[PDB]
Amino acid sequence: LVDTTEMYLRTIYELEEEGVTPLRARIAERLEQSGPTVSQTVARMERDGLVVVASDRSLQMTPTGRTLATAVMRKHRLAERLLTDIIGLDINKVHDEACRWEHVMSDEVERRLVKVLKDVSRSPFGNPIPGLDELGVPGTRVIDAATSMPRKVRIVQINEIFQVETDQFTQLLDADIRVGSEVEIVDRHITLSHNGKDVELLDDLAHTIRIEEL
Ligand SMILES: [Zn+2]
């Protein structure tokens, strides 16, 4: 989704990167949007809790806004690597194309690109590709990762230390499902199978076990 908000956020990120103070006017200039439009948009983002306007009037991304800004720059740069490395688009066109693709590239495509690209260190233009750690290239909660259709996946964390109920502990041990294991999930209650042993989980386990997509 080509968010106006994702464009303001990546712009702030970009200026910061250049060592420029993210003032509203520089942002207006960079986005070729009038001062009145940027105030409008910034006022909105503030309500969304994505940016605060500092004492010196500069814009400061909140942790949630920074995270989203980083995700966008990551997508932008992965798209550029894709564009030059595989597609072979004219180098002179690459940045403008990626500016559009950054809004519609999913996290899944990005994981694939980290896999097929020979190097995701920098963009073709000399800047490091950020947010790779957060892309996961800990993990998605089983509750969010399982679906009506089973699929294998990797166990990242069992989080038993956070468990109040422990009667499922030995099931996991018997089904040889530990951290770093490749099991198969599915929504139905959620049941993660492995070692030929299906393990149906209770709310608490499903809400705390994290699995990295295979
Ligand atoms: Zn670019």
From Swiss-Prot:
It comes from the Bacteria. GO terms for biological process: negative regulation of DNA-templated transcription. Iron-binding repressor of the dipheteria toxin gene expression. May serve as a global regulator of gene expression. Represses ripA under iron excess. The gene is dtxR. Homodimer. Its main location: cytoplasm. GO terms for cellular component: cytoplasm. It is found in: Cytoplasm. This is Diphtheria toxin repressor. The keyword Nucleus does not apply. One of its GO terms (molecular function) is transition metal ion binding.
